[PDB]
Design an enzyme around this catalytic site. Structure first.
Site: not given
Ligand SMILES: Nc1ccn([C@@H]2O[C@H](COP(=O)(O)OP(=O)(O)OP(=O)(O)O)[C@@H](O)[C@H]2O)c(=O)n1
Ligand SMILES: Nc1ccn([C@@H]2O[C@H](COP(=O)(O)OP(=O)(O)OP(=O)(O)O)[C@@H](O)[C@H]2O)c(=O)n1
Ligand SMILES: [Zn+2]
Ligand SMILES: [Zn+2]
Lengths: 310, 153, 310, 153, 310, 310
Positions: A54-55, A84, A105, A134
């Site tokens: 959704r974001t 890594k 994010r 956020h």
């Protein structure tokens, strides 16, 4: 240029009340009179090292309704960068040679702030960093509160659910505490209550707050009811199922609500809000997700455009 | 006669009449305790006038003597319900529900990790009036809940 | 507006013969005279909750050859939405505030139809829902049959493979049974034959069909040979390897075929069609996948544009 | 007010009487069609000694007139029933169920990959082919099943 | 020396009627007086290359009730063999170098038989090879028929369920055809019918069989009712549920069953036999599983012992 | 016959003080003269549906030190049961058909108790059922208190750590309340506090308890210091580290501990007890784990033996 022109959008703490108002003023103009070729020829990178459908989709639809291009990824158990041995600093250092802005994010807190020190003068916008910030959620919540209530001051705001770990409810209280006269009612299971820091801040500014036990206790005075989801894992199944006659919202509970009272929820809403609330006038969580588009269009337009007349 | 109450009364000869079922528990009681799974005459009245105790429900089951344990079960739902046996056209025992030792079958463990959900098991809860409430402890998960948490679910 | 203007495209059952003809007429004009800025400024969401690379890529290339923008995802063992606790209804309810149309492929049947009740007036197009429907495959098959044979009526169509579970062959028979005079030959392993419902429907309309045992048995009369792949899992390895001298197609078998006979396959074609068929004149499965572009351009253009003159 | 008796109980002032319910379908009907969520007086006679079926069930709902489409949702379970409509102690209406075209909410799609299981939608089935024996098609998955199959579970 | 001494028990088609009766008479004695040290000092390998808990725990427990040591692996959870590229011939040539018998399950058909070419004269007992054989499940079923019915001939045996892919119904039909006058009733959905090669073998031996579509057509006459599980993978969701899911036994169907009738089921039973059947005296599926202990003990005893004094 | 003969050891709330002492007196004898063939010929199932190595290896070793055979599985690594849809009632009705006792761990609470309805009279010993009980860990803790302190009454017992979710602190508090004059000191962060139902039970039995926030408030008086691990999942990263991570014992804190004071910890200890504590004479966590051998041996001996001569 505008105040936010190529500035980094990392924490709500870092934006004054005036900046919050500029964003919300722009979003209302972009909602009224679209400008679909405003970021024409800009390429934004959508680096979701942590997946959030959704974001991510609200953001990329913002980029595209202003005409920009999008390159990016979402790394749920996949996709090479960071790896890594591959530092976040070297990922940014490399991607900030390709794009014009970075929305990201990430799961560890401060990742967006570390990015800021490696992106050159490419702006980075935080779409979530661990349990810290956020800002684009808070901006759309305030746009939804301003558009429904008509003001951002002198509100009786009720916050409900996991107040201890909802990142959105910590941010919304900072933000709303930059405006005046707001009264706060915090209804949480005491295993999940407001940190004393939000509370200690609130008292240095003189803001009024009370802690309650059920929404039925404040239903009548309330303008915004902001429900948060309760995290099953941070609770034993048996205490989770035990809390009173619950703190979930049903239309029966709303029979008392003020005519302009609105239920907001950052979503998902598994069971704290029943299906019947969905059809009352007070249900506003889906319109709240549509305002996400206008809030993030506003932030991108202001960051990437010097002067914006609309 | 008339101050209406009865009208051509379903006076039964032998049976149990459950009276004062406190409105809306009437249907619960039928479903939950599977009282219609019989071939004998039942007559049910719902939302009866009972000016004297508001509104109520009433089941009359013929040639059936629902008892003792069976009566105590209803305590959680209809705590003031008077059962009346009848052997020959009138009351031959009027019995009130007492809160029982255990409530079997009917009830569900709130505990979603309790094994009783996926398995061929009849629920069972130990009943304990901690004066204010009645706590119910699951046989299986041994977790203890307010009877209100269980009766929502 | 056109008949399909902002109508939902969920089942072939729901589209009349005239609607099927309108789509196929448009696709032939879009194939002839491109209109690359027709959906300029529209954002379509490509929600593939079930991954299908060839279907997803044909669709997004349709969106882009008409100028639209695309946000979306493919959730093979990844990506947040639906989750568990997150209803499909709430995913749609939220995404239909962001986009202008939703193309979706989902694993449970009717998911597209459930979406229709939550998308507001945003149209949803079904790209596959379990074993029920896949209308955009049927539309491209009929475009390929119309473009090669010149008509959609009075055809001798042979269908081969898993007729019991090919969703595409159930749809193609409904569709072709809206036109007149078509004769059907169904060549299946009897463990995998046409359901009696397709067959019962076909007899209420009076359509002629016969069941055969090998393609060699009908090769000579046939206009379209539609091969379907045989699902290894629904068969024991030992019955799968035992069926006659097989039902796979080799060029030797084609030596009899009519000059205008065409082999169609929805693809993939692991082994039911050998490599040598690929170079005969009758091989048409790859041109059939290119017509996918024109069929889905036509559906999107008609759904999102009121009147379309081309 | 008129002389009830219970073998075939009597007269309500205005309301609906669904009579000649098969036997053991009456409570099924109260459950399924939520006829119970009214504050009106409902009287119900169960396993009663009468019209030819032998025993039969009966529901009397005062002050509610349900009809046309409601009476028709009753057809799969109680097709033999009569739905009397009463005004001022007289049967001003006597209706029967006939097969509807749609049955909403009450059935469960037997197809386990159907999306209807998990979500805030009501079940819906298109109905077809009267008394030689009924097929129901799910609105959502579009699979057509035999009514006895959906009606089992 | 007894006939089974040091034989490989790979297939039911290799064991004669006499072989079958010798095992079953030994099982009956070990059930009656235990012999807990008969295999003292023997070490046996329990190689389950495909996991099967039910079967492994029976085989090992019956190895333990005769005093043998067990070493081995349950894999299908990557425990290291098959890595690098070790052929099964090589794995079995190294394991037969130190154990006295190999019990083995493997996903491919024929694997136990091949083990036999590499084990020297360490006996190989097959506990399942793909869809081919499972001798030890047929030995315990037979033992349970014998022990409850008093005979293995003149039986009226009904087989209900998926008769096409159940490898145990196929084998028990081949074993019972070794004996006289048995009558078979097969009740299967059309897609799960009992294969031709079985049917053809029955015909060639003059044995009576018939197809019925309801258990109540045959209840009255039946001695053993052997139920199988339909795997819904073998059908689609809707097929499984549609009419075909009435191969389900409830207690009410047993109304008129002969007093001696027994219900057997290799297990897991998921829903084809309802829970209320368990209280009936005819339910013998679990007692059947208990008998797997004496049939597997008998085979190990007869194979590792020259002379068995009983 | 002894009171525990053929009992199910499912919960600590079912064992009386007398039951507790009988087990502990038997453990003391088996520790003193071994009985390595007492359970000769018994076969026991070790079903760990949830893996727990520490506990499994103790249970099996103590089965082996009395001469029993062991069959079984550690799963939580998909070893085949639960597939198809085998209920636990059915798994336990088949396993009780051939073993003499079932030892069992399972993720859901109540699972061992249900096993008890299906095992006939094969005893079920619970080795952990979700967050409900673990009798065999409380039996070994008690044995270690008894053996080092000489008594189970008049003790000053401190419980330090996560008292809210540690299922072992809850049970040992219930067991010690069976005895006289014990005093409890609870030292927990605020979020990990000892639940009300425990506290309420202590009050109702007239037993003394108090809350302290530093071990050094109470060191001087303490006999048993029972430490638990805080799972950082139960807090956030920052919470765990912030002030709250001082439930950590270092050797220096033991300065003034009574000469008899013992430090116990069910294990794994990750950092709440520092390595330098191990050299102190008060460190008894590993000797406590060694005692799990005699408490588990005693329960198996008392449950499978009518009369135990000692
Ligand atoms: N021949 C009879 C006698 C009594 N009853 C029923 O049994 C109940 C018994 O109540 P009763 O002792 O007769 O007088 P009440 O004051 O109604 O009892 P209560 O104190 O419970 O109100 C009444 O509802 C009545 O309908 C009956 O059906 N048939
Ligand atoms: N005021 C009234 C009048 C009638 N009834 C009910 O209405 C039903 C049937 O109506 P009626 O036509 O009067 O009797 P029948 O002729 O027997 O109807 P049918 O032949 O359809 O059964 C009866 O069961 C009776 O209980 C009622 O409850 N209240
Ligand atoms: Zn429980
Ligand atoms: Zn359906």
């Amino acid at each position: 240029a505008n105040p936010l022109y190529q500035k980094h959008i990392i924490s709500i703490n870092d934006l004054s009340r005036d900046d919050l108002n500029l964003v919300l003023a722009t979003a209302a103009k972009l909602k009224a009179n679209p400008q679909p070729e405003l970021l024409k020829h800009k390429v934004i990178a959508s680096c979701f090292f942590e997946a959030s459908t959704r974001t991510r989709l609200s953001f990329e639809t913002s980029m595209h309704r202003l005409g920009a291009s999008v390159v990016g990824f979402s790394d749920s158990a996949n996709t090479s960068l960071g790896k890594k041995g591959e530092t976040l600093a070297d990922t940014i250092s490399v991607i900030s040679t390709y794009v014009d802005a970075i929305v990201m994010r990430h799961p560890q807190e401060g990742a967006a702030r570390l990015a800021t020190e490696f992106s050159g003068n490419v702006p980075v916008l935080n779409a979530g960093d661990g349990s810290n910030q956020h800002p684009t959620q808070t901006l759309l919540d305030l746009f939804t509160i301003q558009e429904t209530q008509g003001r951002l001051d002198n509100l009786h705001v009720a916050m409900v659910g996991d107040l201890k770990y909802g990142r959105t409810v910590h941010s919304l209280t900072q933000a709303l505490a930059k405006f005046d006269g707001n009264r706060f009612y915090f209804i949480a299971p005491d295993a999940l209550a407001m940190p004393q820091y939000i509370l200690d801040m609130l008292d240095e500014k003189g803001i009024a707050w009370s802690l309650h036990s059920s929404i039925e206790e404040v239903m009548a005075e309330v303008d915004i009811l902001y429900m948060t989801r309760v995290q099953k894992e941070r609770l034993d199944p048996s205490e989770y199922a035990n809390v009173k006659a619950q703190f979930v919202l049903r239309a029966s509970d709303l029979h008392n609500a003020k005519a302009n009272m609105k239920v907001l929820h950052p979503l998902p809403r598994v069971d704290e809000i029943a299906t019947d609330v969905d059809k009352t006038p007070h249900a506003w969580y889906f319109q709240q997700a549509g305002n996400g588009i206008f809030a993030r269009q506003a932030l991108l337009a202001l960051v990437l455009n010097r002067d914006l007349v609309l | 006669m008339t101050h209406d109450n009865k009208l051509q009364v379903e006076a039964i000869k032998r049976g149990t009449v459950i009276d004062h079922i406190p409105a809306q528990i009437g249907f619960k009681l039928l479903s939950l305790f599977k009282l219609t799974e019989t071939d004998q005459r039942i007559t049910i009245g719902l939302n009866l006038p009972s000016g004297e105790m508001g509104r109520k429900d009433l089941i009359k089951i013929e040639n059936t003597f629902l008892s003792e344990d069976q009566v105590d079960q209803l305590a959680l739902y209809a705590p003031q319900a008077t059962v009346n046996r009848i052997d020959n056209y009138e009351v031959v025992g009027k019995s009130r529900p007492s809160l029982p030792e255990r409530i079997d079958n009917v009830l569900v463990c709130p505990n979603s990790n309790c094994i009783s959900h996926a398995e061929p098991v009849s629920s069972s809860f130990a009943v304990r009036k901690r004066a204010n409430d009645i706590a119910l402890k699951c046989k299986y998960c041994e977790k203890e809940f307010s009877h209100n948490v269980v009766l929502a679910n």
